[PDB]
Amino acid sequence: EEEIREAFRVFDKDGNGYISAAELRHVMTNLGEKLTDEEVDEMIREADIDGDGQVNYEEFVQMMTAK
Template sequence: MAHEMSPDQIEEYKKAFSVFDKDGDGRISTVDLRALLGSLDQKPSQALLEDIITGIDAICDGTIKFDEFLKMMTTKIDYSNTVTDEGLRDAFRVFDRDGNGFITATDLRQVMINIGDKLTDEEVHEMIREIDTHGDGMVNYEDFLAMMAQE
C-alpha cells in the first residue's frame, strides 16, 4: 500500500497534476493523458489510454481526479525499488532527446517545456551542474543513475 507523504510531496503532485490537467477542469481525461504522454514521445492507442484510466478511476467516470492521481503516484513510489535497468535506460532516453548518450541543458530544457515547466537558463544549468560529476556540462548515463539512486 502507499506510504505516508509529506506536505511537500503532496504539493509537488498538485503542481504536476495541474500540468497534466491541460483543460483546467480538475480532472485528467484520456485527452489530457494523451497530451502528457505525447510530450514524452509516446503515442498510446485510445484503448490503452482508456485501460490506464479504468485501472485508477475509482468512480468510473472516465477521468482521474487529484485523489486518484495521488494514489497512482504513491503506488508508483512503492514500486520504485523494482525499477529495472531497462526502465532506467528508457527514462534516460526521454531526456537524451538527440540520442548522443548525454543529457544537455538543451535536452533538459525541451523536456521541461514539454511537460509545462518553463525554467530559466540558470535553473536548467544549475540542475545539470548538480548531476554532472565530470564538470563537462552534460549528464551521462552513470551521472543519471547516481542521481536516481539518491532519490
C-alpha cells in the first residue's frame, strides 16, 4: 500500500500531500493502472482541480485502496 504513497512522495519533494493535477495524472499512468483517461477525468470532475491549484493526492490514494 505504501508503494502508492511513495509514488506520489517522489513528486512531492517536501511531503505535504499537495501536488498539481497534471503531475497527479502522470503518477496514475505511471502506476500502470487499468483505468482509461475518461475515467481519470470522471474522478477529476468530481474533485477539486480548477479552484485552488493544489490537489491533495491523499484523497486519491485512499480512494484507490478502497476500490
